[PDB]
Design a protein around this ligand. Structure first.
Ligand code: AHL
Ligand code: ZN
Length: 393
């Protein structure tokens, strides 16, 4: 009746059919701090169904202080809302995982463990603490858990979706190869409007919007994000690259070679940090070393000495930067979507994707064997008016 399992017996990426009221259990349902209740949907990925008053101390309140923006301090405050959020997000990951491209993308993310580059001693491997959360256990104690990704509700401006992470005092973790745990502010309960001529009035599929955010996550997890000071007169190269298509092509090919070579070298610094490593604080040295051999697709010799293969680097680098794009998701989903990142949004809408009469894992809104199946009729905010309520612009 949500339709979380259209084929087979169980869900294929998300590990449980959770309800928000399920008892805390210390393993995959727990109280955590970065004191909130959270759900572990997969190895290395948690969902926290709460407005984000947490990650930024100048954003501990949902008060309006306003370009494209939308506020409502009441959103995501009841338990039924929280249960809907969590099943909505759950359903999206299963939608993303039903495609070849999304199975590739989500695997890369789970294997993308932030580098253990914490030590001040250049021969000791150590974790970085902002790449963990604290999980209250079955007895009542904490333990620190390493994770790659957190999906969390939006702060004051409900439609400011973004992917962010905590910084280091010396290191630039999103741009040195290392990586860092990524926080996605997102909601499945809202989407955006754009115009299209088959003038037509359509809404973006929220699977494609989550996928955009997850693509920024992969860049930042393998530490290969573009400096945000590189822009067009504003859109950064980092956005142009994530959208892909013809928009990406205006990053000149000589600039690309220069970017790729800079990061070949950073992956080279990482290989030799692994090699010049003698101790580990906090599993063996050689076991954690092999976690990172596996992440960065490193070669090992008879000495047990790691290096960067050039084919293997180009392969991973190309997958993360060129293949994993918004544009390519649109192709796999067979949905309607904006043709360039340069598009101005018009309206915001309230939606409910949880019931299978409203949205499915295979078709999104554009439900097969009905009138919704043709001409992107399900994303038409007049024909399928039932499924979209207008709120701003
Ligand atoms: N109208 C939207 N689709 N808003 C959410 C994304 C906003 C931001 N420009 C961005 O692309 N962040 O990754
Ligand atoms: Zn973006």
């Amino acid at each position: 009746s949500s339709g979380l399992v259209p084929r087979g017996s169980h869900m294929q990426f998300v590990n449980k059919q959770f309800n928000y009221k399920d008892p805390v259990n210390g393993v995959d349902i727990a109280y955590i701090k970065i004191p909130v209740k959270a759900f572990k949907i997969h190895n290395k990925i948690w969902v926290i169904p709460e407005r984000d008053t947490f990650t930024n101390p100048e954003e501990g309140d949902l008060n309006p202080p306003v370009p494209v923006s939308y506020y409502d301090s009441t959103y995501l405050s009841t338990d039924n809302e929280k249960d809907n959020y969590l099943k909505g997000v759950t359903k999206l990951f299963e939608r993303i995982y039903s495609t070849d491209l999304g199975r590739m993308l989500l695997t890369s993310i789970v294997r993308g463990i932030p580098f253990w580059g914490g030590s001040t001693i250049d021969t000791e491997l150590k974790v970085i603490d902002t790449n963990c959360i604290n999980v209250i256990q079955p007895d009542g104690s904490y333990r620190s858990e390493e994770l790659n990704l957190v999906i969390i509700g939006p702060s004051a401006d409900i439609i400011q979706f973004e992917c962010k992470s905590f910084g280091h005092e010396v290191l630039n973790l999103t741009r040195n190869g290392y990586g860092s745990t990524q926080y996605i502010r997102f909601s499945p309960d809202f989407t955006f409007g754009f115009e299209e001529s088959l003038a037509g009035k359509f809404a973006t599929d929220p699977a494609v919007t989550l996928a955009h955010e997850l693509i920024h996550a992969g860049h930042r997890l393998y530490g290969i994000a573009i400096n945000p000071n590189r822009v067009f007169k504003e859109v950064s190269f980092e956005e142009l690259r994530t959208f892909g298509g013809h928009d990406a092509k205006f990053i000149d090919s000589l600039q690309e070679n220069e970017f790729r070579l800079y990061y070949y070298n950073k992956f080279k610094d990482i290989a030799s940090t692994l090699n010049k490593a003698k101790s580990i604080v906090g599993a063996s040295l050689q076991y954690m070393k092999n976690v990172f051999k596996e992440k960065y697709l490193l070669s090992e010799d008879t000495s047990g000495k790691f290096s960067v293969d050039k084919l293997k680097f180009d392969k991973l680098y190309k997958m993360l930067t060129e293949i994993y794009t918004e544009d390519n998701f649109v192709k796999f989903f067979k949905v309607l979507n904006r043709k360039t990142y340069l598009n101005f949004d018009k309206a915001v809408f309230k939606i409910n994707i949880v019931p299978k009469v409203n949205y499915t894992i295979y078709d999104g809104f554009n439900l097969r064997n009905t009138n919704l199946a043709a001409n992107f009729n399900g994303q038409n905010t007049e024909i399928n008016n039932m499924n979209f309520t207008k709120l701003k612009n």
